[PDB]
């Protein structure tokens, strides 16, 4: 079934994760035809500034995420940044996320594959759609069974990303495709007004899921604030994508 | 508001080709009564890559052939001009005057189209940012245009490739009705050397995206036998596939419409 | 010999043209190994705003340019925008300039070629280097003998142009290559600090000439003000490009 | 200030290859005494497109082979790290620690390199704007780096293509010494499918442009027989051509130097 990955960008506190986890659990009950996956980063390892929020560490992170998986029975997903983090993270994360800048780091992908968990690779902003074929092959080589590719925009001049929707059907040839509705409209080094419109485009085109970051108070997010979707808007957007998908799916091309 | 479907052969290869496509468009206009159809065909391909490629049979012949289509089928007409002097004679048959993408900044061409009293449709240049169309519309309004359209047809993305930045649809809607060009947005500029390339397998999904995002119309070239087209062959849509494509966009538009953001 | 095209962007007045013409005449006398060509537009036919300066018309324009060619004996070049302007302009213009946005308009190129004059086509910001081969062929077909291709930047995301110096050697395969040092750093819809550095790059790479706009008081230019090179800086830059060329020319690749 | 020339085989295919290239670099360092040479070679290609491409013989072997080059020829050494833990052992031989382009934003890798006391050279990511390197340098300074380099190696320009925006040289010079990567800037990312492509015919002219604009050094990969390289073959420069290229950049640099803008 259709996949919806959502949660706060960073693990600002397990308190925050439980508040978002509650709303995602609720939505999960209201939309049984959808498989929800809770997402949150235990570390922002690639901030532009040394003076920005990174997180509370992997320890506190896996701890807080475990609390969500136990308290709400929601699947879990978080990103890793170096090979050694694959094993400890695999303890709670149902899906291991590979950062976009790291989509080509062979050992990170192999370490993720080895854990036996599912792997979701964010397509680098420098990568062409067809070049993801090799990414998938590395994961298969590493023993990966559940592989996802996430579209999150492509470099378009400076401090700007454009979403080439031709990548959805192209990447679908070798993996399940997820659309990152949040970071695809962010401006490197974002504009919330384009999140919903492009989400609609992604489902009209055809994808296996949507990646969507949410926060009680977006403007207060310690990371990616100008892109955080308000918690209260999640339901409406999900209902919207399901309806569009239902009608459009009739025309999705055969693999 | 009535959705707009602009369609037709890329070039006026012959009056016969036009009448053949016109008949089908007419048939579709009878079925899809909630759609406003506009028959399109260029009397001249004035910007081919090669001096050896097909251009057309002249403005006179073209206007004559177009008039025949309007008389025989009662369809609105649209064609593009390349120099100011063509605006007047073209306005005698064209309901919508189209401005080529490379020429979207040529002040006199725009002014010439605007003073005819006809509607004007400007193809957004591959070099233009979405927010830069605000001045294009201002020029037209200044020149007297009352019905203005802006057509999205892709943006330069590296060499011989175009990308469609769907953020442009809601941006351009701030000052004009927006049209999505389903065939040229997947075209590969001069990708074939003396001719341009194209990827027909992406035409349909990108069109679905366009209507899901929200636009006021779609523009699509069609031809009985695409591979025989004298121009844009790699992008021409098989005439028999037009009905299904249209039904699909109307369905996707209906279900997505309640979510279209207010400008 | 090496070509230097210079002058004010627009014909703000024949007075302005005579003041710049005097300095270019002087430079022409000081650098005999260089062929100078006076440039100025009788109309800015593609301004973004309807409320901006266009010019005084073709009449007043050809008039003022004729005054420069007679008073200083300097060759002339100006751009045309529609086919009918080729003939009247060919009366004074030694080189007919084709605007970048119009580099693919067949009739404009043919009308220019027919006049017998030399033709300089500005490479469209949407065009690939190799795609200029066809541009040249149209001109040859039209009877052109002296054909130039000018590099003026390529679309790089929004409101930004990047100069791909690989285009110089590629275009040199079928025509003489001129480098537009002024508009190559302008931001569509500019930064003067990059004009000189990239001019140096162009000659180090290898080109047949440089296109350079100048004005007594750049900030007062009615068009392209943020890019107009100060008249007083022309000499130093020319001397600089000649010295770099002299040393680098030893390594220019064979066609 | 002494111009920097960083050169060597792309990968440590074998200690033999290294000693063969090292001998030549050593010979050149004796001739071009006004140049500071740094021998380069990766102990591991950790970001190949295909899982089937050559990677190397391990960090231990690589560091061993590099140390041999430094001992036998007295040449400075530089190699790149891929994870934080590699910084320490690599710092035992490397005079300059290189940070891969895709990893230019990985805070811990940068911090790991900085605390070794060694010089740090960051390849500017193909996704990074020139002005965005200001924070990269700040991170390094924060982590204790006293000698920092920023290397220009091209920017994403459409798919499978890189363009060099020379405006970046004077921009990055505002906060660090700038190095121009003559071989990877003309590389075609994954242009060959399971491998990347490249256009060797542009290496030389772009290098001339780099020195004419103004930089503090050039980085160039070389190999006795480029077409036999186990990686970056389409871009490796023939070892015998190194001397002439270097002489040329020194000549162009000298004549252009009086015009370099002051930062
Ligand atoms: O899902 C994610 O967490 C993330 O989008 C990573 C993203 O959160 C960060 O890259 C974030 O955009 C970045 O750290 C912001 O940097 P600034 O310091 O605000 O410029 O995955 P990616 O690898 O696609 O970037
Ligand atoms: O040499 C030229 O005159 C010109 O560079 C034309 C150039 O002067 C104009 O295009 C100018 O940049 C433009 O009119 C400025 O538009 P604004 O209205 O300031 O946005 O030739 P091109 O065809 O390469 O643009
Ligand atoms: O096939 P070439 O000659 O490149 O020209 C194609 C164009 O005519 C086509 O994209 C469209 O009709 C106008 O640009
Ligand atoms: O040839 P593939 O496998 O695409 O990788 C090439 C890269 O290793 C090369 O550009 C460089 O060594 C690092 O990116």
CATH value at residue C198: 3.20.20.70
Is the distance from CB of A165 to CB of B203 less than 8 angstroms?
A: no
CA geometry: angle C9, C11, C12, nearest 5 deg: 100
C-alpha dist (Å) from residue D236 to B75, C158, D186:
62, 34, 11
Count of C-beta atoms within a 10 Å radius of residue D231:
22
Between the CA of C234 and the centroid of ligand 4 the distance, in Å, is 44
Please give the structure tokens belonging to residue C100: 């970048």
CA geometry: angle C98, C204, C234, nearest 5 deg: 65
Count of C-beta atoms within a 10 Å radius of residue D10:
23
Rounding to the nearest 10 degrees, give the CA dihedral for residues C218, C219, C221, C224.
Answer: 90
d(CA C24, CA D226): 49
| Selection from D131, D152, D130, D83 nearest residue D111 by Cα | D83
Which of D40, D45, D123, D124 is an active site residue?
D45
Beta strands in D63-176 (DSSP E): 76-80, 96-99, 119-123, 148-152, 155-156, 162-163
C232: CB partners within 8 A, 6+ apart: none
- What ligand is nearest to the CA atom of residue C104? 3
What residue in C sits closest to D209 (Cα-Cα)?
C201
d(CA C101, CA C124): 5
Paired with D187 in beta bridges are D198
Between the CA of C44 and the centroid of ligand 2 the distance, in Å, is 7
Elucidation technique: X-ray
Helix (H) or strand (E) holding C170: helix C167-171
Q: Does residue C229 sit in helix, strand or coil?
A: strand
Q: Is A156 on the interface with C (CB under 8 A)?
A: yes
Q: Is D157 on the interface with B (CB under 8 A)?
A: yes
- Subunits with 3+ Cβ pairs within 8 Å of A are B, C, D
Domain region containing C7: 1-255
| Selection from D3, D24, D15, D74 nearest residue D242 by Cα | D24
Is the distance from CB of D95 to CB of D74 less than 8 angstroms?
A: no
Q: Does residue D87 sit in helix, strand or coil?
A: helix
DSSP summary character for residue A123: P
Entry resolution (Å): 2.0
d(CA D100, CA C12): 52
Cβ neighbours of A161 in D, within 8 Å:
none
Q: What is the CA radius of gyration of chain A?
A: 17
Q: What is the CA radius of gyration of chain D?
A: 17
d(CA C177, CA C196): 18
Helix (H) or strand (E) holding C65: helix C58-71
d(CA B99, CA B118): 12
- List the alpha helices (DSSP H) in A36-93: 58-71, 86-90
| Selection from D60, D51, D56, D59 nearest residue D17 by Cα | D56
Total domains in the fold of chain B = 1
Probe ligand 4: pick from D181, D220, D232, max atoms within 8 Å of CB? D232
Paired with D217 in beta bridges are D4, D179
């Amino acid at each position: 079934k259709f996949l919806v990955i959502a949660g706060p960008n960073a693990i600002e506190s397990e308190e925050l994760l439980l508040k978002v986890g509650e709303e995602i659990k609720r939505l999960s009950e209201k939309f049984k035809e959808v498989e929800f996956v809770f997402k949150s980063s235990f570390d922002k390892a690639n901030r532009s500034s040394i003076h920005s929020f990174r997180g509370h560490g992997l320890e506190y992170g896996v701890k807080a995420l475990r609390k969500v998986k136990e308290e709400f029975g929601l699947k879990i997903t978080t990103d890793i940044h170096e090979s050694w983090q694959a094993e400890p993270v695999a303890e709670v994360a149902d899906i291991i996320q590979i950062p976009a800048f790291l989509c080509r780091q062979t050992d990170l992908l192999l370490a993720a594959a080895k854990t036996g968990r599912a792997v979701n690779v964010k397509k680098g902003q420098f990568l062409a759609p067809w070049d993801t074929k090799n990414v998938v092959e590395k994961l298969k080589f590493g023993g990966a069974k559940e592989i996802y590719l996430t579209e999150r925009g492509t470099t378009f001049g400076y401090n700007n990303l454009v979403v080439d929707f031709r990548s959805l059907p192209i990447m679908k040839q070798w993996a399940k495709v997820i659309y990152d509705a949040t970071h695809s409209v962010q401006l490197p080094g974002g504009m919330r007004e384009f999140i919903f419109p492009l989400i609609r485009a992604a489902v009209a085109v055809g994808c296996d899921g949507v990646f969507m970051e949410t926060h009680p108070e977006p403007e207060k997010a310690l990371s990616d604030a100008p892109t955080a979707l308000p918690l209260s808007q999640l339901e409406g957007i999900i209902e919207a994508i399901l309806e569009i998908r239902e009608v459009a799916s009739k025309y999705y091309e055969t693999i």
